[PDB]
């Protein structure tokens, strides 16, 4: 939500490495987003077993979405209660907005049909009623 | 000139030196082409010279090779 | 039709004498590119408009005979008509000059071989060994 | 003998131009070799501190075709053996492309030069991070 | 795009009703240069079935629509 | 003798550029030049369905200045007495104009051509009249 | 230096005969301009980078001799 609010988005485009004219190798091969959510972002690493800093640019956003969340809570009800009007409500009227803009594009009516098409030899596995009930 | 420029390479096995568009006539600038005369005789003439001269000498009873009759 | 220098065009050569010469005699690759390419779009330019209406021409003045074009009026000179044997069609000259022509192919390109091998010590670094002649070398 | 020092140039105008693209006669051709004749002086005049005149009739072209694509090299002003080294055409070319993109309404990926690639400009958009302006204005 | 730059085939020629017919004819004209060239084989309903990892789509797919 | 068809042409580029203006040398002549001959090659072709080789040689220019405003004309290929009535040149421009105002990035005020003026374009904007759409909308 | 016509380009005029009779002689407007346009061009041209040369060297000439140019 911070990195949002400038016109070139940062997600848009990949970066130029020391040399400035080709690009980074990680961000060529690959989507610009999946870069900036791998590497720009998470700064992931190659396995579980390589545990590695902090990564400061991650602490200020916890830390303020633990504030948001006390300074809400702070009494739980007759303080919660004054915020749920706005929360519980925003979402309905994004939703709608986003739906009437999806259902408009080229791939939409044509990525729905995916959605309601089953196949009846999936039913019979029990992972999937496993996770139906979770 | 493209049909001309394509079967030179092909046939003779030459190429031109610098490309050459429709505004030019490079067949047209040799004396038989541009002075109207037909140019096969000197295709045919060229086959009868040594038929004529293979059959002469087995007349005259030839030994060795050919261009020594 | 007359040809001249770029350096000092008040010296311009005729074919006959001066421009046969030069392809004749020189071993210069530049200037024998120069000549070379100079009669051609220096006289071949102007012949282009004219046989483009001297075919026309030519070709009604054949179909008036009975022919059907000027190539098939020019094999008209081998042909023979019922003598039991003898016979040959104006239609046949092209398929015996296309078949004859197939059995020199092969001492011909033994022979193209041979001189391309040999002007690349007389012009080194502008022929290739597998590619074909240069047209203004020959 | 030429094939060395030629570029190969391709152009897609109903992709730039979707529609409205006008046709490709021969008029266009004149355009795009006065063009790179443009280009040419240009180079040769604040890198080489010369003054050559090089014409439309300079700039040689091969094997058109429908895609558009074709082949062309330069040669000096009136020497027909001096053809100027493909690497400098390279150079012309990357300091006027930005102009000669203009007189046909191309950009750069319609008017692929096939040896020669687009660089300029890196991303040095950010003075403030406005990411953590945004975290306090919180 | 590929085969157009094989064979130099005008631009608006080839579009995807007549794709089969397109490169059956530039196979069987020249076989050498058409085995060559290097195709890419996909289709509808096939990237439909990429999995998304674990909160990694409304990170990859809605930001990738909405740029 | 030759100012009754002479066409006169305005040039500001500091004005339409601001800055980036590019210096204006002969170099810019010689495009702009090969460009109107470009101009006059497609309305004879596709008005009067003729096809005339003009080059830059037949664009004639006088009175250059600072203000970098000339005038010029145009005669036939190789008939310097033939001198094609203003009233055509008047038209090849009228309709080649968008395409020589992108070769220079002028834009029809920095190019003024003092006899030719602009007119492209009627107002046909509203299929509604938005205004009595809002006044039911409240 | 010579002359020649754009429609038979195999016709040159020299200047001494030939080019000065037409300008003598002619009252056609268009050939006298053809001929007079054109002998500045052909020849005019060449002698132009000629004529530079000479006059920086016929002024050091006469500097060196006590004369201004
Ligand atoms: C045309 O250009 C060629 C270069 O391609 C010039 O040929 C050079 O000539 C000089 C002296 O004549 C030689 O020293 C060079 O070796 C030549 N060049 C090459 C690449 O070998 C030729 O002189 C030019 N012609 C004119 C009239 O300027
Ligand atoms: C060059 O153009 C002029 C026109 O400006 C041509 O002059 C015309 O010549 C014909 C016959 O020679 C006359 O009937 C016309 O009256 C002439 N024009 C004018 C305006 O009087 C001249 O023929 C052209 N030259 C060439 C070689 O084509
Ligand atoms: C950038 O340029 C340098 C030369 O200055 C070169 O050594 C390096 O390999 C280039 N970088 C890339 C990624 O090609
Ligand atoms: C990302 O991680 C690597 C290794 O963990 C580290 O070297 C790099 O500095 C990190 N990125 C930034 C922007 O600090
Ligand atoms: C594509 O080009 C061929 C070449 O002859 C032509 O026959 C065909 O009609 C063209 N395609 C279309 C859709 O016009
Ligand atoms: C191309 O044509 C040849 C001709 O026989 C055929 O054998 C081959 O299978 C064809 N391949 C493709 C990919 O069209």
């Known amino acids: 939500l911070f990195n949002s609010f400038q016109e070139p988005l940062p997600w848009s485009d990949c970066p130029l490495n020391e040399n400035q004219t080709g690009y980074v190798d990680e961000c060529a091969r690959s989507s610009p987003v999946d870069y900036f959510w791998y590497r720009e972002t998470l700064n992931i690493s190659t396995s579980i077993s390589d545990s590695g800093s902090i990564q400061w640019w991650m602490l200020l956003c916890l830390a303020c979405a633990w504030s948001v969340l006390y300074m809400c809570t702070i009494r739980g009800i007759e303080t919660t209660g004054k915020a749920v009007y706005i929360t519980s409500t925003l979402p309905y009227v994004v939703l709608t907005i986003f739906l009437i803009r999806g259902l408009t594009l080229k791939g939409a009516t044509n990525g729905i049909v995916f959605l309601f098409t089953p196949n009846v030899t999936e039913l019979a596995q029990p992972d999937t009623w496993l996770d139906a009930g979770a | 000139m493209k049909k001309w420029w394509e079967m030179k390479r092909e046939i003779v096995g030459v190429v031109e030196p610098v490309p050459h568009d429709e505004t030019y006539c490079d067949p047209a600038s040799l004396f038989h082409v541009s002075n109207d005369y037909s140019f096969i005789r000197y295709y045919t003439r060229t086959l009868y010279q040594f038929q004529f001269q293979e059959a002469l000498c087995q007349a005259a009873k030839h030994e060795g090779p050919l261009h020594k009759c | 039709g007359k040809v001249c220098n770029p350096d000092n065009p008040q010296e311009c050569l005729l074919l006959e004498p001066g421009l046969n010469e030069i392809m004749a005699n020189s071993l210069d690759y530049n200037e024998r590119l120069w000549a070379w390419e100079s009669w051609r779009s220096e006289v071949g330019k102007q012949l282009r408009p004219l046989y483009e209406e001297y075919v026309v021409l030519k070709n009604e003045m054949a179909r008036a005979n009975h022919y059907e074009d000027y190539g098939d009026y020019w094999r008209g000179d081998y042909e023979v008509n019922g003598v039991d044997g003898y016979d040959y069609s104006r239609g046949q000259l092209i398929e015996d000059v296309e078949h004859t022509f197939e059995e020199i192919k092969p001492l011909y390109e033994h022979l193209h071989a041979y001189v391309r091998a040999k002007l690349m010590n007389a012009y080194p670094s502008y022929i290739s060994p597998i590619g074909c002649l240069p047209a203004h070398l020959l | 003998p030429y094939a060395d020092q030629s570029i190969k140039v391709r152009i897609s105008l109903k992709s730039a131009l979707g529609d409205k693209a006008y046709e490709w006669n021969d008029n266009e051709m004149y355009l795009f070799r006065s063009s790179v004749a443009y280009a040419m002086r240009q180079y040769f005049l604040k890198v080489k501190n010369q003054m050559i005149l090089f014409g439309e009739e300079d700039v040689r072209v091969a094997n058109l075709k429908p895609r558009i694509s074709f082949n062309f090299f330069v040669t000096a002003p009136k020497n027909v053996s001096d053809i100027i080294p493909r690497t400098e055409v390279e150079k012309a070319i990357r300091m006027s492309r930005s102009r000669i993109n203009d007189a046909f309404r191309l950009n750069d990926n319609s008017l692929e030069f096939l040896g020669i690639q687009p660089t300029l400009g890196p991303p040095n958009q950010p003075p403030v991070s406005i990411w953590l302006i945004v975290f306090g204005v919180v | ?67």
Do not use: K, W
């Open chain 5, 1 to 67: 795009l590929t085969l157009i730059n094989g064979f130099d085939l005008p631009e608006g020629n080839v579009t995807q009703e007549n794709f089969v017919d397109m490169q059956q004819r530039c196979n069987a004209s020249d076989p050498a240069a058409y085995a060559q060239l290097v195709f890419q084989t996909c289709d509808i309903n096939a990237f439909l079935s990429e999995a998304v990892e674990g909160t990694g789509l409304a990170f990859i797919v809605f930001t990738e629509a909405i740029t």
